[PDB]
Design a protein around this ligand. Structure first.
Ligand SMILES: Nc1ncnc2c1ncn2[C@@H]1O[C@H](CO)[C@@H](O)[C@H]1O
Ligand SMILES: Nc1ncnc2c1ncn2[C@@H]1O[C@H](CO)[C@@H](O)[C@H]1O
Ligand SMILES: [Ca+2]
Ligand SMILES: [Ca+2]
Ligand SMILES: [Cl-]
Ligand SMILES: [Cl-]
Ligand SMILES: [Zn+2]
Ligand SMILES: [Zn+2]
Ligand SMILES: [Zn+2]
Ligand SMILES: [Zn+2]
Lengths: 524, 524
């Protein structure tokens, strides 16, 4: 049998430097994990041991820390080139700076192929981008060849800024003829590498005839066989085996997110390219593995410009930005309005006919706002200032919530009001009125929401059965601050941009800000 | 006696082309008035008749039409040079594009001296601007000399964007030593030329010893001796004679605004430079006076770039901009919110310690909103589109109103509600609640206003005795749409920027707009 070792990452999300255990900023360096210098060491070790190795990335390198803010994808090309990745699929966040912000920093500088079979370019863009990403690449590995066919979430236009000259096709429809064709060209070993989420990966494994292994991303899915090595709870075994329509067993793998783990799957193939076995597990990149000194020095050198950036003026406020807990855990606070307005602004996406935008509504727990910003230094606002307000390494995510779930969330916001607890919600696109004399769970007396499927945005009463799009912190999507109803009742949850970056981009765009407290939240 | 003819303009406000009788856009060319080509003809005629002539401008050439929008003061230098002005005082609107927007287009290109004795530069700006404007200029006229000493409203920092490196001193304090000095240098004929308003001009005439004539501006004051030639109602005789503290009779003159009239004052002086007589009257620049063909051709040539500009994209809307009367004369409409938000944004000025900004509140009659803007052409918004919404050639002005006056204005807004009448008010920085079941004059049941002397903008109940700053159309400041209480009770009224330009600048800054109807106005 011919044995291949597939190493893979996904949803690394700009975690170029080692992180704490929960993927936030590293504080105690001796206990940190991940980062590209540590990944380099482990990949180099495995390449000395294993004759036939592919290192694959399943997309979403872009977006997540100050690295992406400042270097805009140049750091992705540079460090993935240093790690000698063999191929990468395009993720939704590769479109965050538009097509131009994908072509120039990443597609033109990567030394490895960048893949997606289900993205079609139209208009003048087609000739500009032709060949810069590919539907597939056939790679030599030893005396053999392996075809790698790429795919990208069809939901990308709702999640990122791909423009209107890219069309995202159904993955299975796009994939099948490419896999068909490779088989006719005597490529008998096929890896589907792409960025649509575990549920779609399993459908691809089941329905795309000839795929031998699926390497996926997007859903930050952690799979593990045995007792897991850290805090992530496995969604299933690694690999996760799908029985295909043609009767084969097809391994599906993913490796969580943030560069914390290196996926590692060993596959034996027979001479006709059929998988005869598959085994592996993601490797926790913990502090027992040394950071490669050369990569780490390079990281340190690139960090200088980040340190410079962190104190540079982004824009100005002419008002006090009240992110105090005495305000934000008790009433509407202007820092909460500012952050919710930034959240909506970041989520302006190309709209279908019937919508002005697909989302209008925002909630933000007041316990997530960790500092004011005063008017010292002539109202200058810096990245460092915003990092004190939003210090947790969160993202502002898109969820779908029934109106009845949102009503429960607003009851939870005030269920024990008066104690300075974190669950009190700041809002955008929502007007709520509380009567604190009523029993807990019966305190919300009016709840109006800004329409989306309207030509003129305006407020209507919340409807219990309607499913609303809402932007909120990943902490809340995950049921943080007692918002268990959000986690247990949501219909869809997509991970969005870095919290600090959402706000910094908004301030930079606005230039001079003056957020008011304007009656989005009232009592009585 | 030595006889001097002083010709003067003030507050021309970008009316380079002939206008209708009310100074708005010319429609019927055979009935139009003013414009620089017609002014040229009249000035040339008077210079053939009168040996000793000065042509003076008292400031506020900048701001008022698409000319200023596109040419940013280059048109002012070019056309005032063509008319061979002898001197100009700086007005408040000369600072609308900051100090940089004054130095480069106007101060460096004017062929005549530009004056202000009461503006002092500090910091690095002092050496950058030194000599580009002057406190005074001594001009030869025949065998004689005449000193011209300049002044500018001390309120300029509240009205325009002069920055923080210019200090506006008390006019009388600044003027006196310059006039003192000229007298010691055997300059015995002194004209004070400046831009502080008729009330200050009269104080300068009374108190600045040695001033022989005051030529003023800023208040758009029309003075006339006899039956007036058009619709402007005279505030007093021309000249208006002040008895000075030293016992002399000192003529004060002004010539309305918009280039409609050419001031014309004949002064006889004795050999010691004392005024022995003064007589004159502004000349209505009506269609009996031909437009000079060469100036008019030059105007036509400069107009090409304006015509190009008028259809160019300023920014984009992703919402329908509802400026329909069925919306704006009956309820809150998003086009009214947009325009009020632009009005406040344009009036962000350097703030004293206690304020986030000096003004937060806006009212706009719904009858002043004359068109929607739909989402045809991918949401593009052009100057031409905005000219359909705001077609009257108005400005958005700053007034001071007691709370009791504003309450009356909101009662007037709904006194005959239901008929689609123009007086219904759109708002910013104000939240009003009407109960239309109550008698007319008793329909306002809640009226909250956004604070200014606060670190965090927030709403408090309107107070009847407090005097509020409000931005509103000149039409309302003048008592239009039955708002007689505004005209009769206001404490201060300053003329602001062109209505269309306020909105175009705001849209260009915001790039993509999505104004909502958000409950600024409610019923019941
Ligand atoms: N990761 C996080 N993201 C946002 N908010 C958080 C996070 N962790 C803790 N908090 C907030 O901090 C409060 C405790 O100070 C909690 O009530 C919660 O509101
Ligand atoms: N010069 C103007 N500026 C603003 N609004 C005006 C002007 N002239 C008329 N209107 C408005 O038009 C309405 C009549 O259509 C009036 O009720 C008033 O609201
Ligand atoms: Ca195979
Ligand atoms: Ca004299
Ligand atoms: Cl999924
Ligand atoms: Cl005055
Ligand atoms: Zn991701
Ligand atoms: Zn993704
Ligand atoms: Zn003026
Ligand atoms: Zn003025």
């Amino acid at each position: 049998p011919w044995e291949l070792t597939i190493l893979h990452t996904n949803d690394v999300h700009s975690r170029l430097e080692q992180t704490s255990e929960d993927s936030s900023k590293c504080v105690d360096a001796s206990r940190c994990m991940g980062g590209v210098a540590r990944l380099f060491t482990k990949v180099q070790q495995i390449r000395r041991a294993e004759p036939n190795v592919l290192l694959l990335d399943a997309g979403d390198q872009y977006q997540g820390t100050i690295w992406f803010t400042v270097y805009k994808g140049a750091e992705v090309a540079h460090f993935m080139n240093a790690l000698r990745y063999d191929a990468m699929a395009l993720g939704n966040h590769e479109f965050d700076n538009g097509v131009e912000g994908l072509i120039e920093p990443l597609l033109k500088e990567a030394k490895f192929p960048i893949l997606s079979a289900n993205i079609k370019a139209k208009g003048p863009l087609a000739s500009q981008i032709s060949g810069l990403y590919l539907p597939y690449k056939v790679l030599p590995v030893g005396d053999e060849v392996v075809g790698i066919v790429g795919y990208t979430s069809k939901e990308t236009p709702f999640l990122s800024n791909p423009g209107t000259n890219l069309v995202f096709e159904d993955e299975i429809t796009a994939l099948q003829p490419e896999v068909d064709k490779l088989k006719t060209l005597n490529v008998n070993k096929i890896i589907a590498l792409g960025h649509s989420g575990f549920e779609m990966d399993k459908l691809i494994a089941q329905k795309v005839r000839g795929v031998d292994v699926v390497v996926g991303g997007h859903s930050n899915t952690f799979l593990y066989t045995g007792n897991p090595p850290s805090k992530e709870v496995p969604a299933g075994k690694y690999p996760f085996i799908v029985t295909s329509d043609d009767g084969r067993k097809v391994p599906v793998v993913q490796a969580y997110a943030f560069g914390k783990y290196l996926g590692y799957l060993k596959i034996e193939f027979d001479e006709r390219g059929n998988v005869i076995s598959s085994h592996g597990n993601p490797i926790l990149l913990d502090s027992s593995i040394p950071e490669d000194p050369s990569i780490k020095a390079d990281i340190n050198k690139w960090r200088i410009k980040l340190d410079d950036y962190s104190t540079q003026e982004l824009g100005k406020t002419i008002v006090y930005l009240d992110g105090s807990s005495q305000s934000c855990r008790f009433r509407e606070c202007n820092m909460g309005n500012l952050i919710c307005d930034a959240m909506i602004n970041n989520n302006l996406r190309h709209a279908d006919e019937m919508f002005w935008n697909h989302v209008s509504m925002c909630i933000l727990n007041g316990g997530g706002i960790r500092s004011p910003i005063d008017e010292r230094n002539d109202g200058t606002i810096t990245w460092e200032n915003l990092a004190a307000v939003l210090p947790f390494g969160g993202t502002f995510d898109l969820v779908q919530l029934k109106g009845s779930t949102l009503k429960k969330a607003f009851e939870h916001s005030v269920h024990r009001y008066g104690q300075s607890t974190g669950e009190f919600l700041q809002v955008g696109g929502i007007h709520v009125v509380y009567d604190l004399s009523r029993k807990p769970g019966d305190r919300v007396v009016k709840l109006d929401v800004l329409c989306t499927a309207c030509a003129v945005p305006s407020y209507d009463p919340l409807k219990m059965d309607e499913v609303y799009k809402v932007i909120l912190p990943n902490f809340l999507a995950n049921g943080g601050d007692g918002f268990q109803m959000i986690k247990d009742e949501l219909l869809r949850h997509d991970s969005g941009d870095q919290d600090i970056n959402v706000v910094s981009t908004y301030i930079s765009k606005m230039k001079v800000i003056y957020p008011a407290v304007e009656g989005r939240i009232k009592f009585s």
